């Protein structure tokens, strides 16, 4: 049939800075509880490129990529707590535009 399940409200807010056309930095204000590990998962809207990075429960910031350009990427920072459930901070971010693939001359 179909899969149904309400999503619990996020503990804190997400922040995207130094975003690029092939990458994007995702940082949070830290969860209200201590964690052992953090597995962030990013995926391109309309079902596209997806990945998964790992970071220490202490890490409050992690980069992503290689991402796409002018494309929205659904970032979900999953904080795997040490034997006590887990949370997932959802955050959408629109990557920057990439420079045309056309390569020409240059100057020193």
UniProtKB/Swiss-Prot annotation:
Glycan attachment points: 58
Quote the tissue specificity entry.
Answer: High expression in heart, lung, liver, skeletal muscle, kidney, pancreas, spleen, testis, ovary, subthalamic nucleus and fetal liver. Weak expression in other tissues tested.
- Domain spans labelled Fibronectin type-III: 11-98
Q: Which compartments is it annotated to reside in?
A: Secreted, Extracellular space
Functional summary from the UniProt entry = Probable collagen protein.
Record's protein name: Collagen alpha-1(XX) chain
Q: Can you name the source organism?
A: Homo sapiens
What part of the full protein is here? 557 to 651 of 1284
């Amino acid at each position: 049939g179909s899969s149904g399940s309400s999503g619990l409200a996020p503990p804190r807010h997400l922040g995207f800075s130094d975003v690029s056309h092939d990458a994007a930095r995702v940082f949070w204000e830290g969860a209200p509880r201590p964690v052992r590990l953090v597995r962030v998962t990013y995926v391109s809207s309309e079902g596209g490129h997806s990945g998964q990075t790992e970071a220490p429960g202490n890490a409050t910031s992690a980069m992503l990529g290689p991402l796409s350009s002018s494309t929205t990427y659904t970032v979900r920072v999953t904080c795997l707590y040490p034997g006590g459930g887990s949370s997932t901070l959802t955050g959408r971010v629109t990557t920057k535009k990439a420079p045309s693939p056309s390569s020409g001359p240059s100057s020193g």
